[PDB]
Amino acid sequence: IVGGTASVRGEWPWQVTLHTTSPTQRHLCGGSIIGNQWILTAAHCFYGVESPKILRVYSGILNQAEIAEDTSFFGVQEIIIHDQYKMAESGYDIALLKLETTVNYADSQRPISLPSKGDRYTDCWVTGWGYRKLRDKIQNTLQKAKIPLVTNEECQKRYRGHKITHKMICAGYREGGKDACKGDSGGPLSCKHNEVWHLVGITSWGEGCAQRERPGVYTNVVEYVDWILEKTQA
Amino acid sequence: IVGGTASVRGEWPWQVTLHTTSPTQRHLCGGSIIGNQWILTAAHCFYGVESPKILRVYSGILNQAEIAEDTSFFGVQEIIIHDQYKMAESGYDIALLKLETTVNYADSQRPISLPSKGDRYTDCWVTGWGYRKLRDKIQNTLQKAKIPLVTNEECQKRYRGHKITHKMICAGYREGGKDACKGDSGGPLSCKHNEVWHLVGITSWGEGCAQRERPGVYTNVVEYVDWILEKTQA
């Protein structure tokens, strides 16, 4: 996250850090708890991941320093990537992780509500342990930044070489300065409406990070609520 | 219906009583007229029904005592159950009855409008001839009860062993006392908005009837308007 600040412990209890253990353990992406056995994240996080055996999901984390070899984690039983996904910039950048065990909800870890088709937001935040600038490194403390949504027409003007579809949502300041970046991929764009937090977007792509006239692009979660229901069925 | 009152004759002209003639004739479920040849109802009503030949639809009824062997009815040519339906509690609880003859609309019998995707309600009523308590019997006079809708987040808290999906809608009072019950299955949850009645829900399931902190669960009809259009085509 560029231009953000440190989060308060437990203020984004749906946020997870997804690690890979290959070659050595490191944070790979963000994600969101949406159900007792389910994390919603970005499909592009799984480039080159041939097996879910190398993944670990950590919930209830503020600082990456909390994660040691003796820290509990959730194993991943299955990676479900949208069957129309090819690459972040062409959309469908959404994936589910089915966990091996169920999350026990607590003040530190609980699910975020999915947006309602009926709500198709002025208090939106992007969170993560990603870079603070394009060439940087993973941050210890979960960062947060408040960013305004921009219309799809506005976003399209900023990305003339792309097709900004109704299955994408954009957020950014005209002058830049606050945005998601590498490593924030897969995490939430969370919006508070009528005192309830909604998972409105999934961090997906953008040209650089926090540049002027280059909003962040996110998967528009409401366009996938039918897909999420279909894929999370027994 | 628990905690309801007798309806005025003709005030719910889309409501039908669906009877089975097997082994002897009795009310089986409610339904709603949505087209000249079409009744919308719940799929769970058809457990063990192997043929539409045993069904009779009666329109324009207030009291079951109006139904005698000499009373006119509509035969059922076809039962169309949603192909994803398995059981009420897992959703897709929706079915169409294609009638053998067409309904001639009148002050006693006319169709209810389907909800618009654009309207994704404070004046909602559930109606039927079902039980007044869990272990009871079919009622003579069509009953009505005004019940507030509850959010899907609220409903989910009341049914922790279920998945309350966006394809379901819930309605009930926190203290209970008014609800649908056995025998109301398949009937409408009708909401009046901008002076027009909309078929918002279909009576589907609930734990007990009218219990405290146990809202009634209904099929969210707006999530099926595309299915209804597809299935009612020639």
Added chain:
Amino acid sequence: IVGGTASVRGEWPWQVTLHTTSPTQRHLCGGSIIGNQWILTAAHCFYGVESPKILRVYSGILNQAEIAEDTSFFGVQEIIIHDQYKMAESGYDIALLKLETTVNYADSQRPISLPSKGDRYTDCWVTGWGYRKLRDKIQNTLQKAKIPLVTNEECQKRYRGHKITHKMICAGYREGGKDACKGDSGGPLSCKHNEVWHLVGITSWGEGCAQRERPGVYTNVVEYVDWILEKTQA
């Protein structure tokens, strides 16, 4: 267009005139620029069209007199008709034309935004070079008429022999007098909302033109945004 007035040059820069060259060149239908290589129009325009080789799309036109044998046009590489389309009156009346070359946007020719599912209008206009009455001829100057939308319930009362679905939108005055007509087929029903023009409808059918109690029927474009995205993908 019945009861309209001449347009100002460039005030509907998404409007195109689609011509056929067979047997001799003439205006066939209207359409709307929605992308650099894409025109959205009505499927019924292509009755008897066996090849896209006979089509020519002209952009930036006010008067048909501007079109001469030396006027530039866009060739059509492919006609994509909705696979559920059979006839205008039963819906799915939508088609895409993939152009052979891309449109270079200018003050005279630019795309209209598609409606958002979130916007599911009081300033709606229908435009075209069609007839001014049922038995007439193509008009030289692009005509415009402001027409109010009517609800689908109201529209259904006016077309009792048809099924007015949620995939259709109607517009008209109770007393008639302003409407689209033959030759306006395929053109836009454009609505201005929050200072942005949205392509809300595609001119499709109606009984006569501008008759009392016979609104114009249009394809409800918002119900096709997923189809448009699917079909315009590489």
